[PDB]
Amino acid sequence: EKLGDICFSLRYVPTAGKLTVVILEAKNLKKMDVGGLSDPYVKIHLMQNGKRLKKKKTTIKKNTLNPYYNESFSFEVPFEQIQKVQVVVTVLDYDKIGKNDAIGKVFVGYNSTGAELRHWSDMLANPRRPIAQWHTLQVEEEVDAMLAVKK
C-alpha cells in the first residue's frame, strides 16, 4: 500500500506531432524514514519494440510524501506510433540524501492495462488535454520482466 502512485497527464501535441507527458504530482513516497521523510526522485524510459530508445529524467524536491513538481516529457513520433510505444516510469528514493531503491514502477503504452491504455489511446491519441490520471505502481521486481522485451 502506498508503494507506488503517480498522477500523470496524458496528452499529445498535434502542432508538432510529439508526446508530452505532464507529471503533476504523485502520492507514493510514504514516510519510510524513522521519524523522518523520504527523498522522491523519478525518471522515465521508453522501450521501442522492447528496446530502450530514449532516456529522460525529472527533478523532484526531496524530503516529501507527494512528489510534485509538474514536468513534461516530450517524445517526437507520428500520432500512429504513439499507440504502439511503451513508456515506463522509474521511481527511486535517496534515503537520507544517500541512495535507495525498490520503489514503485509502471509501464504505459500499447499492451498496458485497461486503466492506462484506455486513457493513453484516448487523450494523447489525438487531443491535447492535460488530463492527469493516477495508478498503482508495482515494485521494480515486475518492471524487471517488462523492460526485457515486453512487446
Ligand X SMILES: O=P(O)(O)O[C@H]1[C@H](OP(=O)(O)O)[C@@H](OP(=O)(O)O)[C@H](OP(=O)(O)O)[C@@H](OP(=O)(O)O)[C@H]1OP(=O)(O)O
**Which residues contact ligand X (rule: CB under 6 A)?**
39, 41, 59-62, 94, 97-99
- To ligand X, the closest distance from the beta carbon of 116 in angstroms equals 25
Q: Is 39 annotated as a binding residue?
A: yes
Contact yes or no for 6/106 (Cβ under 8 A): yes
- To ligand X, the closest distance from the beta carbon of 101 in angstroms equals 11
14: left (phi over 0), alpha (psi -120 to 50) or beta: alpha
Please tell me what DSSP assigns to residue 137.
P
Q: Is 93 annotated as a binding residue?
A: yes
C-alpha span between 43 and 56 (Å, rounded): 6
State which residue, 23 or 60, has the beta carbon closest to ligand X.
60
State which residue, 2 or 99, has the beta carbon closest to ligand X.
99
Q: Is 101 annotated as a binding residue?
A: yes
Task: Give me the residue label for grid cell 524536491.
Answer: 61
**DSSP per residue, 11-27:** -EETTTTEEEEEEEEE-
Nearest CA-CA partner of 136 in 22, 28, 17, 14? 28
- To ligand X, the closest distance from the beta carbon of 133 in angstroms equals 24
- To ligand X, the closest distance from the beta carbon of 146 in angstroms equals 22
State which residue, 10 or 91, has the beta carbon closest to ligand X.
91
State which residue, 91 or 147, has the beta carbon closest to ligand X.
91
List the binding residues for Ca(2+): 33, 39, 93, 95, 101
